[PDB]
Design a protein around this ligand. Structure first.
Ligand SMILES: Nc1ncnc2c1ncn2[C@@H]1O[C@H](COP(=O)(O)OP(=O)(O)OP(=O)(O)O)[C@@H](O)[C@H]1O
Ligand SMILES: Nc1ncnc2c1ncn2[C@@H]1O[C@H](COP(=O)(O)OP(=O)(O)OP(=O)(O)O)[C@@H](O)[C@H]1O
Ligand SMILES: CC(=O)CCCCn1c(=O)c2c(ncn2C)n(C)c1=O
Ligand SMILES: [Ca+2]
Lengths: 694, 146, 49, 48
């Protein structure tokens, strides 16, 4: 594996049809027989593993202990037909067979897997690199065919990206992807987050900041991955471990609890439908259920208790599951603003930025970078801005003890405090807690959950308050969410339209008051006249309340003008009211809703078209790639997979710095400097090597 | 076939076979596909309308029972919202069908302490149900055409 | 799929569809790994015939 | 119509130079090329 690493290091910066790559191929050809032997070793043991997993081999297996005779093993293998007879003899020799000649095929197969994995992966990477950089060499094809099994096995774990290197040439990078990372990526929550991120960047995202947004998304995704791993299911200590298990269970089952709360609310309101009011008990009214069974009344009490409990549990689960990302992003953006923007050092917030005024607090707190990984942000900010702005002032701002900083580097100190409740209370950081609680209470989802909880509590006081929880279907269901988003899209316009309707109705009210009072009697008896427009306020209420609701306007609801001197003025009054209010303004509302539907539809359609037509990374269109068959699909899955870029970031994070290659160190340094030039933009391996590749 | 057999039992069952024009005619097929394109959304909208009407029914039951008499004779009072179920049926059945909402179909609140609460009740019912939700149905159909 | 399980062992399996040798091809493909006798039992095949 | 008017204006400005008439694709062949072209090479404010 080390020698292959050296070979790959030789291949660093290799161009297509490079001299060093051709020399490597010539060396491999000279060493073909031993290369064949190594590849055969690996493929034989891989096929051994898959065969022993095969049920057909279990048919030959007939011993309860699980062992197999050598003859039975040979018969099984010759039935599978994958192995030649010499290979079967070699496999038997490698097998540790007892005096009875019985074999533990399980250990026999598992023995060589892990030891050969790293060399196998590096061999696969070497062959792939050489194949791609020497596209047309017949001699490499034989080695590739012999390595087919290795390549197929390591296909999911081989990550390929393209960068712009210091050579000023696009370069292809091969690395390892771990099973855990791939599975964590494939988890559905990450998939939904990816979809939402893609929608956001495509709709409201600029090309210049697309890479920055993508990197931020990757980092937040990593945080979510580690949270999920923490919660994943495998006297003070017993209490704490049981507490952690309960909170992790709540975090894992948060959504199920939400659905359960919806179910309980629906059942409660179904029961409430049976309520009735009577003067007599089963001058004040009495409310009671009307059900012969007698069982529903206790059921309502039980359901209310469970709904209240589930609301509390959902609040806790939200706090455990989702708040950490909120705090992580808040801390991260503040840290970047300090280090690069120099906000509180140089700029200071606008004073209309409540978030900045609030974020001032956590700076001097020790706990500042709790969730966010960077614990050295304070020292970096100091080293950056202290010469200009004063080291002592930076330290006062950031709660830094300059004397402590150097002694920590000088010598390692362990003043561990014995565990105590008083010690924990003294440890608590009240200012950081206050900042966190402000962030959370500003968070909308937390606020909705708290309102849910409070309304359940009020339901315990008066059961009818539980009906509000039926509104949760909007957030529960994506379909209703979208339908309501149709309304919300143009809500400001709708409110302004309502105000305009109020104004026009007010003007019509003015006209009626000054000229058309006589017509507004609504009393049948002449002795008692009910006149709506003797007072302006009453006239306005009458108009806005009856006339708008009427199809034909106010003229429908007021006295006929026939045989009156003002008859034509009033017919104009009525027709204009009808057309301006009943027809047009309503029409404005309908059209705003319809346009919202169309806008949302064209947004989704545009996102889809852009993704199918262009690379999220390159910016190059599908036409150039489809010049080669399936070229765009290959480019997206293999050449420029954003998931592979994310995996590369994780691999860099988990890899030691001394072990990085030149390429990896280059990309890592740009990560730390927050330079995204390594991402290819307007260029690709194919485009760079077009003449040679074809 | 089965509906024709039942038509032999009662001739009026044959009317169902008139529905075959949709599959017979491409034009009607497309027009109906306009509706089907967003049928799930339409059903969810109907459920949401049911929920809003249920909440309005709750408010009326707790506060606005007196206004729901529909009997002309004082001796015999017909009150819709003395029972929740009946109040819900009354709302969903008359108010939705009414252009001006339930306020069209119930007793005037003039000269009552709850008059402004009820005018808000009626106007909000009118705007949320008669105007917007219907508007959602119209727009879904139009978007299906497009 | 649960329904389609049935027709496999039936002789008439490829009645309308032209390929009448699908069973033999499937056997030649998967029998070494999965057992010829089991494939034949699944597909209603008489190896002797 | 009003919506598609605003959308068309925005698309045209993001896709072409108000001065050149050349598309963003040619410029984006070089990274951030259209943005550099608009701010530095062919800024209409700079012409003013
Ligand atoms: N750089 C890119 N990397 C990845 N996908 C890209 C890129 N540029 C464009 N795409 C498009 O992204 C789409 C990714 O598919 P997507 O993740 O949405 O699949 P899915 O339907 O959710 O299912 P699954 O991923 O499980 O197969 C591909 O169809 C490809 O057209
Ligand atoms: N020749 C051109 N000169 C300038 N801008 C151009 C030109 N051609 C196209 N554009 C587009 O004009 C846009 C100019 O931005 P605009 O003036 O609308 O910004 P803004 O949102 O008002 O804010 P600000 O100018 O304060 O940053 C750029 O995004 C660029 O895409
Ligand atoms: C690379 C970038 O700009 C985003 C930061 C998130 C990536 N990242 C790290 O870089 C890192 C880290 N821990 C230590 N380091 C140096 N974690 C957790 C991380 O996500
Ligand atoms: Ca090294």
């Amino acid at each position: 594996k080390d020698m292959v690493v050296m070979l790959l290091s030789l291949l660093e910066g290799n161009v297509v049809n490079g001299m060093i790559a051709r020399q490597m191929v010539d060396m491999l050809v000279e060493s073909s027989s031993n290369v064949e032997m190594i590849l055969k070793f690996f493929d034989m043991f891989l096929k051994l593993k898959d065969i022993v997993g095969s049920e057909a081999f279990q048919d030959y297996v007939t011993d309860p202990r699980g062992l197999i005779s050598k003859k039975d093993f040979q018969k099984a293998m010759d039935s599978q037909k994958q192995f030649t007879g010499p290979e079967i003899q070699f496999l038997l020799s490698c097998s540790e067979a007892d005096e009875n000649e019985m074999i533990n095929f399980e250990e026999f197969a598992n023995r060589f897997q892990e030891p050969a994995r790293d060399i196998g992966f590096n061999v696969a990477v070497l062959l792939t690199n050489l194949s791609e950089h020497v596209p047309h060499d017949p001699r490499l094809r034989n080695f590739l065919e012999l390595a087919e099994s290795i390549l197929e096995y390591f296909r999911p774990y081989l990550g390929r990206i393209e960068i712009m290197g210091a050579s000023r040439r696009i370069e292809r990078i091969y690395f390892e992807i771990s099973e855990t990372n791939r599975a964590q990526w494939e988890m559905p929550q990450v998939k939904e987050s990816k979809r939402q991120f893609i929608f956001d960047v495509v709709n409201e995202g600029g090309e210049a900041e697309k890479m920055e947004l993508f990197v931020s998304f990757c980092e937040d995704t990593i945080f979510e991955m580690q949270i999920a791993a923490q919660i994943s299911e495998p006297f003070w200590g017993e209490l704490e471990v049981q507490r952690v298990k309960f909170l992790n269970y709540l975090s894992r089952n948060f959504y199920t609890l939400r659905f359960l709360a919806l179910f309980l609310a629906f059942a409660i309101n179904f029961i409430l439908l049976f309520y009735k009011v009577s003067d007599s008990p089963p001058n004040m009214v009495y409310y009671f259920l009307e059900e012969s069974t007698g069982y529903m009344e206790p059921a309502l009490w039980c359901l209310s208790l469970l709904h209240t409990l589930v609301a509390f549990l959902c609040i806790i689960g939200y706090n455990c599951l989702k708040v950490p990302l909120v705090i992580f992003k808040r801390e991260k953006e503040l840290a970047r603003k300090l280090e690069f923007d120099g906000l509180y050092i140089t700029e200071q917030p606008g004073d209309d930025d409540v978030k900045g005024q609030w974020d001032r607090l956590v700076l001097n707190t020790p706990s500042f970078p709790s969730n966010y990984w960077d614990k050295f942000v304070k020292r970096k900010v100091l080293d950056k801005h202290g010469d200009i702005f004063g080291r002592e002032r930076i330290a006062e701002l950031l709660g830094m003890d300059l004397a402590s900083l150097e002694i920590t580097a000088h010598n390692e100190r362990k003043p561990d405090p014995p565990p105590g409740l008083l010690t924990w209370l003294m440890s608590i950081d009240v200012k950081y807690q206050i900042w966190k609680f402000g962030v959370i209470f500003t968070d909308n989802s937390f606020l909705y959950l708290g309102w849910y909880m409070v309304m359940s509590l009020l339901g315990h006081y008066n059961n009818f308050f539980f009906a509000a929880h039926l509104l949760d279907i909007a957030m529960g269901v994506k379909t209703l969410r979208t339908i309501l988003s149709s309304v919300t899209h143009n809500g400001k316009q709708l409110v302004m339209t309502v105000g305009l309707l109020a104004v026009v109705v007010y003007l019509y009210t003015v006209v009626a008051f000054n000229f058309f009072r006589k017509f507004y009697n609504k009393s049948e008896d002449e002795d008692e006249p009910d006149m709506k427009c003797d007072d302006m306020m009453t006239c306005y209420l009458f108009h806005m309340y009856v006339g708008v609701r009427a199809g034909g306007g106010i003229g429908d609801e007021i006295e006929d003008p026939a045989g009156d001197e003002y008859e034509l003025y009033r017919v104009v009054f009525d027709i204009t009211f009808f057309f301006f209010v009943i027809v047009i303004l309503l029409a404005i509302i309908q059209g705003l809703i319809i346009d919202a539907f169309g806008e949302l539809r064209d947004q989704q359609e545009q996102v889809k078209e852009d993704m199918e037509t262009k690379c999220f990374i390159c910016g190059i269109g599908s036409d150039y790639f489809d010049t080669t068959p399936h070229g765009f699909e290959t480019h997206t899955l293999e050449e420029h997979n954003l998931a592979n870029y994310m995996f590369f970031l994780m691999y860099l994070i988990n890899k030691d710095e001394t072990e990085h290659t030149g390429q990896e160190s280059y990309v890592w340094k740009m990560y730390q400097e927050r330079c995204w030039d390594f991402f290819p933009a307007g260029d690709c391996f194919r485009k760079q090597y077009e003449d040679q590749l074809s």
